[PDB]
Amino acid sequence: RNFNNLTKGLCTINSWHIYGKDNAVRIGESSDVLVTREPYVSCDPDECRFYALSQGTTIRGKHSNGTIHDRSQYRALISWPLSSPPTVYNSRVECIGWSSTSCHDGKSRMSICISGPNNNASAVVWYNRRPVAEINTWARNILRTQESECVCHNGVCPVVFTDGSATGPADTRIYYFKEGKILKWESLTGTAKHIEECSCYGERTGITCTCRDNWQGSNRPVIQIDPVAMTHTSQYICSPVLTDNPRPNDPNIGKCNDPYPGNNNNGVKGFSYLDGANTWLGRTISTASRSGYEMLKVPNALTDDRSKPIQGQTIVLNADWSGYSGSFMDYWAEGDCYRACFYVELIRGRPKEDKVWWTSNSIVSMCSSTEFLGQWNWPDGAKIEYFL
Amino acid sequence: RNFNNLTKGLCTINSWHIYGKDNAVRIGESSDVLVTREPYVSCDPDECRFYALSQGTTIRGKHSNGTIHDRSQYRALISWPLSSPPTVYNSRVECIGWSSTSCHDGKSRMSICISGPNNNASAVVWYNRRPVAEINTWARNILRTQESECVCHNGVCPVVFTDGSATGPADTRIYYFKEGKILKWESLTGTAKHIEECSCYGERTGITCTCRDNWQGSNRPVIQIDPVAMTHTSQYICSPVLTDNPRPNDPNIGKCNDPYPGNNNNGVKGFSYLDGANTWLGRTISTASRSGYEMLKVPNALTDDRSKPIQGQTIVLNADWSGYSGSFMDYWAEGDCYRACFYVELIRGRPKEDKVWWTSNSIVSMCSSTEFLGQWNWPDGAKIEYFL
Amino acid sequence: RNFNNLTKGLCTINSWHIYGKDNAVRIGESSDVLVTREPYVSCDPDECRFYALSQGTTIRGKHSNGTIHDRSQYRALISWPLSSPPTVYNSRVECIGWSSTSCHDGKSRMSICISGPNNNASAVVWYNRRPVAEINTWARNILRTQESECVCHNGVCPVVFTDGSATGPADTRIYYFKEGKILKWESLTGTAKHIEECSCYGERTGITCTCRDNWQGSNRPVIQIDPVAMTHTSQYICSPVLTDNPRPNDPNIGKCNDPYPGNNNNGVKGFSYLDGANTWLGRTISTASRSGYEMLKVPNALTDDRSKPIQGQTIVLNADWSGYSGSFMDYWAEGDCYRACFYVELIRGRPKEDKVWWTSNSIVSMCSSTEFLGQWNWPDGAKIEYFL
Amino acid sequence: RNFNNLTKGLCTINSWHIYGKDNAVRIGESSDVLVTREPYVSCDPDECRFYALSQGTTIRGKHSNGTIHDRSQYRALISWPLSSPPTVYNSRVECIGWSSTSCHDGKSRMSICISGPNNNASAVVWYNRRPVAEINTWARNILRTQESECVCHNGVCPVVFTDGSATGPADTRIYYFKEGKILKWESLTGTAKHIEECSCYGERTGITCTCRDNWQGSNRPVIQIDPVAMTHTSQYICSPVLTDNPRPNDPNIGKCNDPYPGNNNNGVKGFSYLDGANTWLGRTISTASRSGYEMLKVPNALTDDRSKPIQGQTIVLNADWSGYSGSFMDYWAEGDCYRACFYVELIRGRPKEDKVWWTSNSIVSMCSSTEFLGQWNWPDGAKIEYFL
Numbered sequence A, B, C, D: 001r002n003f004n005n006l007t008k009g010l011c012t013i014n015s016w017h018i019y020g021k022d023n024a025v026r027i028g029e030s031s032d033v034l035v036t037r038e039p040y041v042s043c044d045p046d047e048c049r050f051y052a053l054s055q056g057t058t059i060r061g062k063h064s065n066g067t068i069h070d071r072s073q074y075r076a077l078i079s080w081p082l083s084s085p086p087t088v089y090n091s092r093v094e095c096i097g098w099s100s101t102s103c104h105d106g107k108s109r110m111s112i113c114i115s116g117p118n119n120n121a122s123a124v125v126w127y128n129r130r131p132v133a134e135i136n137t138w139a140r141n142i143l144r145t146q147e148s149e150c151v152c153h154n155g156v157c158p159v160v161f162t163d164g165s166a167t168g169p170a171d172t173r174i175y176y177f178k179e180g181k182i183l184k185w186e187s188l189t190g191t192a193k194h195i196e197e198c199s200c201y202g203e204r205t206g207i208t209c210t211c212r213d214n215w216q217g218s219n220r221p222v223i224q225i226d227p228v229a230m231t232h233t234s235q236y237i238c239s240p241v242l243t244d245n246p247r248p249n250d251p252n253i254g255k256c257n258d259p260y261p262g263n264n265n266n267g268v269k270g271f272s273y274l275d276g277a278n279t280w281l282g283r284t285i286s287t288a289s290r291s292g293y294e295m296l297k298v299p300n301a302l303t304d305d306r307s308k309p310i311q312g313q314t315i316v317l318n319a320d321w322s323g324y325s326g327s328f329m330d331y332w333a334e335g336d337c338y339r340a341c342f343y344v345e346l347i348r349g350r351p352k353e354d355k356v357w358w359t360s361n362s363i364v365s366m367c368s369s370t371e372f373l374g375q376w377n378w379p380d381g382a383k384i385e386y387f388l
């Protein structure tokens, strides 16, 4: 087969339909379902799969005790069939670590896992299920990457890494891989002041990443990557429709080249589709906690610092827990355009539900529709008392 | 490969032999078997599989509590290997929803799931395991479809949908799909007064659907579809051998173009094979509850309003619970004719067995034989007290 | 690919080496392992698999209570990977019933299951995982067949069936199938007075079946089938080395054309390889119960009514339970000769161990070696008290 | 496809990165994970897999009681997907026995299992998942082999066997197989005085085995095999950096042709990569017990009896249990050189943790990097109290 080429634009987004949901925590109440977090979705040319970071234990297993912990030697990036739960028996390990990305280039899949102690972490780059390249920490402060799929164009797969402080200036690098080999890496340029956990998608013939400013910003940093020239720019979403969490209330003027202030030293992984008038932003409903999720149609959110919603859709009720969210597309589907998709992580357990001693999640996933479809709300569905 | 063409007639039906049985509830007493309901069977050119709507939990799982509920965000259409139980680990999710159909066209499989709230439901059409088309509710009252396989001819797959009241006139549409794309849709024509949960099979070169009249009828509505012209007619089974449930006792004159009265606002999904003198009707043995199942040979049941049984076979004893039933065939088997098959849903738990708080089912499945084979009876086999 | 042709003779048998063992009961103490009985082994051209009749429940499942029962609607012929246990999740159902056979012809597999009540049982013949032919009971008294693999030559697969009394004259038929279709069937001819559960193997270019006389005989009936002419003969193993169970002590003169007396109305499925001086007989060590198993080299056992052992090998200690045993070969292995193989069923639970209320089994399997290898003993290995 | 040829040298080893870890004991606390020991890793041309000797029971299963036992009829060589746990459902049995090796030759896999009583054990050689050759015990004292992968060159796969005393002179043989057939076998030559459990790797165009001296030596025996000529030599690692366990403290002069004294009648399976200045030795950190693991860069360890470490990396903390370790490489990866890999067995339970009555293990696995990557430590991660 061939390297996939980003030759298509996004489909028109008039609503979102249900694409995938695994009900992991519901099922894992009485099945050998693996504790996970930081999930995402990524497609091969013949199959789409769920991904997450395992915690090396099942939910009912006693080792689930204390899995709010982010980084341990018992974590690993796993994938499993679409809308199935991540079980001990059906899960395929891609690589070992506690921060990851993964993407198919049309021929084979590249997966990257970061492992190690905070001051000595390292990334291993896997291609065609074999280890190919390794990158050592350059700032010795929790080397970390996207926690969602990367995008490939003609065999070139850009990945965004960050090494350094989570509450101040850090050292962010965009790496360009082909077949697992390092072609080139760049220091972060542009006006974005802090970069974490970029959510990327590809469209003719560029790659757009919506990331997390954990330092001072409640608006989201945007990195736009050219995968042919292997260059990039950065700024923020200009829109006053702020999409981080926690975050202040929406002003009437956003910020294009600086963080919008109000909430320091925190954030959540999130995403957006920036496509002129076809722009949709995702965010939690709450401005304080990781609860609820909605999609908002905000024309020219990227460049218009006055832009407001003209349409929207509720994905998760504010009364229900959410969490991380990120973008993905099936680049091998039929049609003239790429259908925009995303997932929402539904975190259950700690810190918000400390009656149990574990932290896991399930996945809900949506794709766009050119129809104006009715909306439902998609909660995790598990009842905590059952786990007591 | 090629699109399957309905070039064959039905085989002669002189009896029914055992084809499949999963013993799900028996096995699920001490295994991670998924709670399901509304099951069916559908074949690929190289494999036949069980299908059902999952409830997003195992039987022993505490979340099975309250699964008599029909529609929730935790349901999904799953398939699994023939005569295996639907387990957490061996089940493949086809799409997310609480009403479905699915069928192979010879090249790839089309699956359709409906999800959403009662006044805003929507169908997503999957083809080759990718979402292709979406249909929004047109009557805003539980958009719903067949709950058994559809039939394809030369790439054209007709599906029967209903939107609107379950106790009065509703808005029924026949959709014609090819490769997941909507070719055409039609409003329901003919003399059938209410349409739900059609059970279809294909024979040279038309498609016959036996459905459920939930309004006033205890005789079954029949839709006959021409998949080339993409047109249809409707009426009832003329036979006084009434095959819904609940239902009145068999009269000596049936009704061809109107519901036979006696039982309002209720029914069960059922099926028939209408083939002149090769006609076999299926039904529950009880006229009051979903218990028992039998096949009755009723010559010209479709057109003869005096027709009576001349042969029969017991499938499930009246002392045993049954439920939904529907038709399917292996259109890729060897031979000159299509062998008629069906399944019976064996519902266990609520409402009829309320010592437990769940509702699930297992599957028994039969196909026709040109031999006159001895009959057995096929109960679910699970003992409720074990679940207490 | 092509139909397999029996073009080779048996390899020289100088000992037996371990080939397969699943430890099902050991593992099933704390895993979802299916209760089974009547197991065997059968090879495809690219894989060899374990087979058995499931009881439709796991060992720990409460439904295992009463599985000493031979025939129920919850039984089915399952296969699973070599030396794995028969679990809920890894088992593939071949067909539904409580008596079976199965064999590959080089192109596809034919499986046959008998189901039904005692006076109305019927066999369904599956080929390439599709139902092809059906045979109704001709004597209305537990229609039953081999409970081990059949053998195919040039697409022709002979099967031995018996219908009628287990304690008197019965109606035995040899059926000849090709691609699941009935080519011909014959009434049992020769001097064998009672036929049950034949164990067959194929060698240039005939098929040899060693069966069970449940009526009066403690010597074993032998059917020799010509798969080209589609004809057969029958007699007993002439050897005074009696190989049924229960059985009298070995005399000095056996019987060639009549049952050797002493034990009526009982027996066990067993096997032999009859190959001139390369002859090996299998049997239980005990003459009273299904315990122990040994192979005995008895030159010309088939024709010499004075023949005695000149070599042997213990397979299972007399202190350990055994059960059914049968023959199989990999007809697609490399080499000039067919390597003789067999399995022993290790029955655990009732009737011999009635502290538990279930009956299951595990499998040990051996093949011949041209070396003179050391012997071990192969017990089931499960400790009953753990199940209490 | 073709026979793999050892045409490449080792890559430069500047550090080790994480390659695989299964967390079996953590996961097996609440999942059907098989009790194992003596694990290793071996690659096919399209997949790499974990291997181990099963104990025929799960960890939570009551039959895990007493699995410190080395040799029983319930053991078997199993393989399962990389970094998954060895579960009942995902494990593939390769052959039956309590001592093993296995390796792909580029076309198919050869697996060897030894079973039997101590004075009558025998090896069965499997090729392409079929039994091909058998070797009887020649010294009648626990016939035993490598417990890690073998290496093939042009279809020739050398295996090191030992039969005889574990505390004195034994009879060691190097067997040369092709497609499972015995080409030739040799008695052990050279200056190595005792040989057990060789860990081998292949490099242009020879095979290097690092073994265990269980008699008098705490330095490791090295066998170097020529797979074309089918000949070999033996000696010890000259280095004073002693790498057995238990072992004395490191002297300043090692031994090239005799055992370094201090610890009798004990040892552990271990490995090394001997490549001039690219030499790395593995060993436990403790000199007394199987705890901890480290890699040490020791230039010319094989020939220089004064050589000392100039670089190193901790793999497992001394406070954590280790166990067996062995070498493997992906001989089908891309590149100009072979990347050196190894695994460490992390033994949990008895004898060191006798609060539980079982003995199992999990696996950590590493490969080399030409980068100088930061190090972590990789413990098993299971907490014993959970199992009480």
Ligand SMILES: *[C@@H]1O[C@H](CO)[C@@H](O[C@@H]2O[C@H](CO)[C@@H](O[C@@H]3O[C@H](CO[C@H]4O[C@H](CO[C@H]5O[C@H](CO)[C@@H](O)[C@H](O)[C@@H]5O)[C@@H](O)[C@H](O[C@H]5O[C@H](CO)[C@@H](O)[C@H](O)[C@@H]5O)[C@@H]4O)[C@@H](O)[C@H](O[C@H]4O[C@H](CO)[C@@H](O)[C@H](O)[C@@H]4O[C@H]4O[C@H](CO)[C@@H](O)[C@H](O)[C@@H]4O[C@H]4O[C@H](CO)[C@@H](O)[C@H](O)[C@@H]4O)[C@@H]3O)[C@H](O)[C@H]2NC(C)=O)[C@H](O)[C@H]1NC(C)=O
Pocket (backbone or CB within 6 Å): A240, A241, A248, A249, A250, A284, A285, A286, A287, A294, A295, A296, A308, A309, A310, A311, A312, A313, A372, A373, A374, A375, B119, B120
């Ligand atoms: C079956 O399903 C269908 C399909 O899903 C359902 O229909 C959907 O219903 C939902 C819910 O109502 C809609 O989502 C909302 O959309 C509105 C935007 O639509 C309105 O505004 C448009 C823009 O108007 C402006 O510009 C135009 C320029 O021409 C001008 O005309 C106008 O006067 C004004 O100047 C209108 O164009 C639009 O009209 C169109 O749509 C109508 C249908 O809605 C139709 O009838 C019309 O004919 C026309 O076609 C419409 O009036 C979003 O604004 C809204 O999002 C806000 O509200 C939710 C709360 O519900 C909140 O969570 C959001 O975050 C957002 O509110 C925050 O952000 C604002 C901007 O920063 C801020 O000002 C707010 O104060 C608020 O801020 C606070 O909350 C946030 C959140 O925590 C916090 O962060 C802040 O700090 C602060 O605390 C919804 O997304 C769908 O659009 C609609 N879809 C369709 C296809 O109709 C249907 O209801 C279902 N049926 C049933 C029976 O249930």
Ligand SMILES: *[C@@H]1O[C@H](CO)[C@@H](O[C@@H]2O[C@H](CO)[C@@H](O[C@@H]3O[C@H](CO[C@H]4O[C@H](CO[C@H]5O[C@H](CO)[C@@H](O)[C@H](O)[C@@H]5O)[C@@H](O)[C@H](O[C@H]5O[C@H](CO)[C@@H](O)[C@H](O)[C@@H]5O)[C@@H]4O)[C@@H](O)[C@H](O[C@H]4O[C@H](CO)[C@@H](O)[C@H](O)[C@@H]4O[C@H]4O[C@H](CO)[C@@H](O)[C@H](O)[C@@H]4O[C@H]4O[C@H](CO)[C@@H](O)[C@H](O)[C@@H]4O)[C@@H]3O)[C@H](O)[C@H]2NC(C)=O)[C@H](O)[C@H]1NC(C)=O
Pocket (backbone or CB within 6 Å): B240, B241, B248, B249, B250, B284, B285, B286, B287, B294, B295, B296, B308, B309, B310, B311, B312, B313, B372, B373, B374, B375, C119, C120
């Ligand atoms: C081993 O296995 C074999 C194979 O399975 C077993 O053999 C099978 O046995 C079963 C059970 O007996 C049979 O099923 C029944 O079949 C009859 C129909 O067959 C009879 O009627 C035929 C038609 O006769 C009429 O027309 C001809 C025209 O020529 C005329 O000759 C005749 O005088 C009359 O005018 C006859 O042709 C037929 O004869 C043939 O078959 C004989 C074998 O049966 C053979 O001996 C003959 O030589 C000849 O070849 C035969 O006489 C069905 O009527 C019946 O179904 C009714 O009964 C069951 C109860 O058992 C009920 O559940 C059904 O729903 C149905 O009864 C309801 O419907 C009627 C119509 O509406 C109504 O009038 C009834 O009052 C009743 O209604 C009530 O109940 C329902 C249900 O709840 C409710 O909804 C209503 O409101 C109301 O309450 C059976 O299906 C198989 O046909 C037969 N198969 C074979 C191959 O033989 C064998 O027994 C097994 N062996 C052993 C040892 O067990």
Ligand SMILES: *[C@@H]1O[C@H](CO)[C@@H](O[C@@H]2O[C@H](CO)[C@@H](O[C@@H]3O[C@H](CO[C@H]4O[C@H](CO[C@H]5O[C@H](CO)[C@@H](O)[C@H](O)[C@@H]5O)[C@@H](O)[C@H](O[C@H]5O[C@H](CO)[C@@H](O)[C@H](O)[C@@H]5O)[C@@H]4O)[C@@H](O)[C@H](O[C@H]4O[C@H](CO)[C@@H](O)[C@H](O)[C@@H]4O[C@H]4O[C@H](CO)[C@@H](O)[C@H](O)[C@@H]4O[C@H]4O[C@H](CO)[C@@H](O)[C@H](O)[C@@H]4O)[C@@H]3O)[C@H](O)[C@H]2NC(C)=O)[C@H](O)[C@H]1NC(C)=O
Pocket (backbone or CB within 6 Å): C240, C241, C248, C249, C250, C284, C285, C286, C287, C294, C295, C296, C308, C309, C310, C311, C312, C313, C372, C373, C374, C375, D119, D120
């Ligand atoms: C490592 O592994 C190796 C390989 O496995 C082990 O070596 C094996 O050891 C076993 C056990 O000893 C052997 O099995 C037995 O074989 C004998 C037959 O071998 C003997 O007899 C041969 C025939 O002799 C006759 O004919 C020749 C003609 O030339 C003539 O020379 C001779 O005088 C006599 O006329 C001899 O050829 C043979 O010698 C050869 O082998 C020797 C090694 O064994 C070797 O040293 C010699 O040099 C020569 O090469 C040898 O003497 C079987 O008879 C025996 O089976 C009987 O006994 C067991 C009990 O152990 C019983 O269960 C069997 O069913 C059978 O006994 C019943 O059947 C008889 C016939 O009907 C009857 O007469 C008996 O009374 C008895 O009947 C009773 O019990 C049954 C069972 O319940 C019941 O049904 C009845 O009603 C009644 O109650 C064994 O199978 C292997 O052959 C041998 N293999 C090899 C390769 O050596 C080695 O031991 C292991 N090492 C260690 C350290 O453990």
Ligand SMILES: *[C@@H]1O[C@H](CO)[C@@H](O[C@@H]2O[C@H](CO)[C@@H](O[C@@H]3O[C@H](CO[C@H]4O[C@H](CO[C@H]5O[C@H](CO)[C@@H](O)[C@H](O)[C@@H]5O)[C@@H](O)[C@H](O[C@H]5O[C@H](CO)[C@@H](O)[C@H](O)[C@@H]5O)[C@@H]4O)[C@@H](O)[C@H](O[C@H]4O[C@H](CO)[C@@H](O)[C@H](O)[C@@H]4O[C@H]4O[C@H](CO)[C@@H](O)[C@H](O)[C@@H]4O[C@H]4O[C@H](CO)[C@@H](O)[C@H](O)[C@@H]4O)[C@@H]3O)[C@H](O)[C@H]2NC(C)=O)[C@H](O)[C@H]1NC(C)=O
Pocket (backbone or CB within 6 Å): A119, A120, D240, D241, D248, D249, D250, D284, D285, D286, D287, D294, D295, D296, D308, D309, D310, D311, D312, D313, D372, D373, D374, D375
């Ligand atoms: C992030 O990750 C990185 C990468 O992993 C981390 O960096 C790593 O850190 C580890 C731990 O410190 C290092 O491993 C140790 O390496 C030393 C060897 O390196 C030293 O020695 C070299 C040789 O020196 C000699 O020769 C040269 C010839 O030119 C000469 O110059 C010199 O004077 C001397 O003559 C030096 O070349 C080397 O310098 C280089 O490296 C420096 C960085 O380390 C760098 O700064 C320099 O500029 C230069 O480039 C360096 O000085 C090993 O010796 C050591 O292994 C011993 O110690 C451990 C305990 O920690 C022990 O377990 C080992 O078994 C071994 O000690 C035993 O064996 C000896 C030999 O038999 C014996 O003499 C000892 O007494 C001891 O024996 C006792 O214990 C054993 C064990 O139980 C027992 O069996 C005995 O019986 C007895 O009881 C370590 O392996 C890595 O090399 C290093 N890697 C890199 C790339 O830097 C970094 O730290 C991490 N960052 C953070 C913040 O954590």
Ligand SMILES: CC(=O)N[C@H]1[C@H]([C@H](O)[C@H](O)CO)OC(C(=O)O)=C[C@@H]1NC(=N)N
Pocket (backbone or CB within 6 Å): A038, A053, A070, A071, A098, A099, A100, A142, A143, A144, A147, A165, A166, A196, A197, A214, A267, A268
């Ligand atoms: C490498 C790492 O630990 N990344 C963190 C992430 C991180 O702490 C923040 O972005 C601060 O830099 O926060 C969160 C979070 O829940 O907000 C999950 C991630 N956990 C994992 N990726 N395992």
Ligand SMILES: CC(=O)N[C@H]1[C@H]([C@H](O)[C@H](O)CO)OC(C(=O)O)=C[C@@H]1NC(=N)N
Pocket (backbone or CB within 6 Å): B038, B053, B070, B071, B098, B099, B100, B142, B143, B144, B147, B165, B166, B196, B197, B214, B267, B268
């Ligand atoms: C969409 C929906 O909920 N369909 C119902 C169905 C429906 O209520 C009746 O046909 C009335 O219209 O009844 C029943 C039933 O048990 O009779 C199961 C179905 N459940 C599911 N398909 N999930």
Ligand SMILES: CC(=O)N[C@H]1[C@H]([C@H](O)[C@H](O)CO)OC(C(=O)O)=C[C@@H]1NC(=N)N
Pocket (backbone or CB within 6 Å): D038, D053, D070, D071, D098, D099, D100, D142, D143, D144, D147, D165, D166, D196, D197, D214, D267, D268
């Ligand atoms: C065949 C056999 O039993 N090999 C032993 C091995 C052996 O005892 C020593 O090398 C002494 O010769 O020791 C050990 C050990 O834990 O040190 C595991 C092995 N267990 C297994 N391979 N099953």
Ligand SMILES: [Ca+2]
Pocket (backbone or CB within 6 Å): A212, A213, A214, A215, A216, A217, A218, A244, A245, A263, A265, A266, A267, A268
């Ligand atoms: Ca922030």
Ligand SMILES: [Ca+2]
Pocket (backbone or CB within 6 Å): B212, B213, B214, B215, B216, B217, B218, B244, B245, B263, B265, B266, B267, B268
């Ligand atoms: Ca009705």
Ligand SMILES: [Ca+2]
Pocket (backbone or CB within 6 Å): C212, C213, C214, C215, C216, C217, C218, C244, C245, C263, C265, C266, C267, C268
């Ligand atoms: Ca008998």
Ligand SMILES: [Ca+2]
Pocket (backbone or CB within 6 Å): D212, D213, D214, D215, D216, D217, D218, D244, D245, D263, D265, D266, D267, D268
């Ligand atoms: Ca030693």
